[PDB]
Symmetry: D2
Subunit: 338 residues, 4 copies
């Protein structure tokens, strides 16, 4: 359908807009519990509603945020003051997105390598989510690097690629732009060069599968890890190194019909997440927009500021805006540091 293809491509380009990127706010109940913990907030619906409203009602946010990934609860939620979360996003011109996977399950007879579940009923969910205001979807797969254990195994990589390709095609049949997230975890003490090799291998398998399932790259986005040393390493790789190996790994594997690569921050500090993106965009221009789809790296300071205390709201929204601005500028290679 030319009409569906056009819509998907237009929406994908709008999400990958220059100077903008994604707020990943799609923490499940159990994932958000953890965050609310760090600042000693109790995880009532009302609080989740307060926090999500705090994010999405931030004045001017849409200058830097093109799209927000929601958890299903939030998609159908109202702010404490009674406005639908989707209408907050719409007032800032931020496109609502929806996490659609059902999370992870061990692959039988692997060393705790994970499949991503969620295809059953996906098509029907996508239809409902579109009617609810979503225009893009997210599905996260996870791989581990462990050279001693041959991780990621063939089965790991082939499963991740199968699920991502099926999900992406199903999204596109339902007018949702799929974000394809094959996250290679930082777990371990491998060097950046090992991450690079594994990332290239995984992305080659993912894009071959996307092609096999007839996914329209013009109407899709990628959300990969940056290429870094493992998290058991004592010093992080330099920003220059991370940018070098990350851009190279992408240029080696990703066809340029894909309109955007929206990195996950994967445990990086807020500042590193901005600086590492900025370094890639000094190296511009590129075949595709290199931008951000950040959760913690946009939210961590905002949360630690808000503190569960309502009174801390304005301060926390200002802090969210500082980080959104930083990453918008980093998209353009114009972030000066903070």
């Amino acid at each position: 359908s030319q009409e569906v293809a056009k819509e998907l491509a237009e929406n994908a380009r709008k999400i990958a807009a220059p100077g903008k990127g994604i707020l990943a706010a799609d923490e499940s109940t159990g994932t958000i519990k953890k965050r609310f913990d760090s600042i000693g907030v109790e995880n009532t619906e009302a609080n989740r509603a307060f926090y999500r409203d705090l994010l999405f009602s931030t004045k001017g946010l849409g200058q830097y945020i093109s799209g927000a990934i929601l958890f299903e609860e939030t998609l159908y939620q109202k702010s404490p003051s009674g406005v639908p979360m989707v209408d907050l996003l719409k007032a800032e011109g931020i496109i609502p997105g929806i996490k659609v996977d059902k999370g992870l399950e061990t692959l039988p007879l692997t060393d705790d390598e994970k499949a991503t579940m969620g295809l059953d009923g996906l098509s029907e969910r996508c239809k409902k989510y579109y009617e609810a205001g979503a225009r893009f979807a997210k599905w996260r797969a996870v791989l581990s690097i462990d050279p001693a254990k041959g991780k990621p195994t063939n089965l790991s990589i082939t499963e991740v690629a199968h699920g991502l390709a099926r999900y992406a095609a199903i999204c596109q049949a339902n007018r949702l732009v799929p974000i394809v997230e094959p996250e290679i975890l930082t777990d371990g003490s491998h060097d950046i060069t090992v991450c690079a090799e594994v990332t290239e291998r995984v992305l080659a398998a993912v894009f071959k599968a996307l092609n096999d399932h007839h996914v329209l790259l013009e109407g899709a986005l990628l959300k990969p890890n940056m290429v870094t040393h493992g998290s058991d390493c004592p010093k992080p790789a330099s920003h220059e190194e991370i940018a070098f190996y990350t851009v190279r790994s992408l240029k080696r594997t990703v066809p340029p019909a894909l309109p955007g690569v929206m990195f996950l921050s994967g445990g990086q500090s807020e500042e590193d997440a901005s600086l590492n993106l900025n370094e890639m965009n000094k190296m511009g221009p590129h075949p595709f927009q290199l931008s951000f789809s950040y959760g913690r790296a946009l939210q961590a300071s905002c949360l630690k500021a808000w503190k569960g205390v309502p009174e801390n709201k304005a301060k926390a929204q200002q802090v969210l805006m500082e980080r959104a601005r930083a990453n918008g500028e980093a998209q353009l290679g114009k972030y000066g540091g903070g």
Copy 2:
């Protein structure tokens, strides 16, 4: 686990027992509605319970039937007289089995080629079904032959193989013997030789995938189509031909660690279904047991006899027994015709 492997292999061999095979009684509500229609029975739970009890309470059935595939409702059902369906099977020494797929969905951007859905929550369902008395599972995939349209497409075959391998591994992790059913439909007017070529191609892909997912063949069973002309053909292929091409297609693709091949009857008459199996077992002995997993081909006369009329019960159970005996004898290559 040696213990789990042992159990699976023992159970698979028990299902593929000489002189016996499977009653496929796993019709969904909507599938059973159709059958109850032909004889003008209304599809109440009570009737479904009456009919399933009529099958499973048939005295001596376990002489010829090693295993019965149930629909979930039936697994947790009681006969009209109040005995659990599973306890009827247990009294005849018939192993309960459970259909675990969630049925079919179109693959995006194919010409109505089908994925089989059901992996989400499968592992947990298998655990519950095992506790309920199931010891084997069934998952049906479907492929079409259409040479003009390049059916079955690569995407069709690769999806069918992926789902069957994932399902089989998940079953085995939960102590259930998986029946792997990749049914190539008879739709169309292709010759038996075309069916043979496609069957061999599909089975080669299925068994490579089973190997890739670490499925234990000793603890699995296959439920393939026989190799026949398409159903738009004027005369069926001869029993000798069907047996020739079917056994050859299997010998060309199936490793002999697999303990049984339990054919689906796929629209064949009750008599053809018996004769075609019998012809294969004159050609014995074989590397694996060639037997039956029949639904209509065991049930059609039984249903048309029972008529929804209770009074017709004994006659219908006698008729079921005639067909069970016929197919048990056919497993041994000793069926004389009926």
Copy 3:
């Protein structure tokens, strides 16, 4: 080896230089026989030497031609006047290249689909050719489109990709930049959209294989067909269409680490070959250089001018220069027509 990688990447970029492209002059004895026929020249070594010298001694040719693909004879040949062919190329700053495949052979049990032969002794040949002055290599694979016959078959595509990946890796181990040529023939009456679909499928398989064999894309080049209607079609597709579908097919499949895509002209007129390239480069800038590797489309007029008559030499070299200029300008999207 950083050193070998650096050399390959530098040389690939030099071949894919802006405003320049490749003269494909690697006609075998039997292929060149045909050309010499059209103008009634007899195929003596001396004539082949005269014609190749006529091409390579063309004054100023290196303004538009970065590289020349030779046949083995020519690589070790002297011009009639006694100068080595390689030294003619070196005086114009044109990089010598070498065809290294051994041509085509039918794949058993296909409908005359072709494997490309040549891996045996390739590594050793590459070493010798490098010592002889070659810095890049060429290997041609061929695929056919026939939807009724399911061409190109899986076996066709997988063989083409295997041979190209093996060859490319072997070249790179020997310091030669591989030109990867998977030519999809124009044979048949399929529409441009069918060519596009098949081209994308083939390129996806080729680049996955290149990744699997550890080929360095930064040190390689692609020589694909343009995307066109089949040659049994009455009107050629418009330049705009050909450019649209060709650039899209590339953007959909080719990672942008590849430095150049040097099209084959595949039976196009000299003028179409220039105009179609020029149209793609109005659509610039691109993720990779889109340029030319033309044989007939650079040579046809030159040959028909020279006529086997020596006296026609200057005229024929002027004619070669007109076409080289045209295609150099087309690389830049600045060709005005001829």
Copy 4:
């Protein structure tokens, strides 16, 4: 061609005849040099001719040897007394076979993992070899187990399978039964269970590729390693273990349309090679004939007896006969030890 298929299947069954197996006498000049060394014989043609004649003229050899694999020299050789080597084989009713690979080459950018070369000109060679009296061919691929280095790598396995499938199809198009030899070397100190896992993985890939290339299994033979501990292990696995894991690895992967599995002895003593085969055939009957294709394990004592001394001829031929008888009896599970 029914006619070619019939011939191949008949010949494959004749090679895999009960109570018989293959003498692998296809040592290249450089391989035979080594053997002639151990007993201080100088490697003249005349000696190679003497030794090969000593083997092939052994009276009654054809009771136990169905087929002899030759090196090309030997296929076109005469015995010292002037009889063609092929005519010696024909007088004993032994089918001549021919090694057709061109040996091994490193795969670029692997840790010295090997491709097998030889496809170029294979078809034409097969035609000539058939005219010369060959009716079966051999092609050896090699893989290593090194879990620390992820050997055998995907590239290793996929290359081995590609070459074996291409070669097998080409042989069959030329009326030669292909012996498919994917030898997993014993190098290293891995346990028998690791060998088993790797063997199963490799055979699954090989047989999927054979299917993809349209190889007729009924007209082919396999020559795999037995499943054993690595050669750096202090005690060999027991005969019972080796037989258990070897038969299981085959039953798990090899379709039973294949008529024979003719093991390589891979560094085993003459006695172990016989006992290990005999142990497998106590476990009979099997889906395919389990037999032998032995070089050293048939020849070692014969060579050490002959000593380069002509006078030792009769003794050496008697010794060859003892080992041929032993392995013929082992095929039948009736060898009592020596």
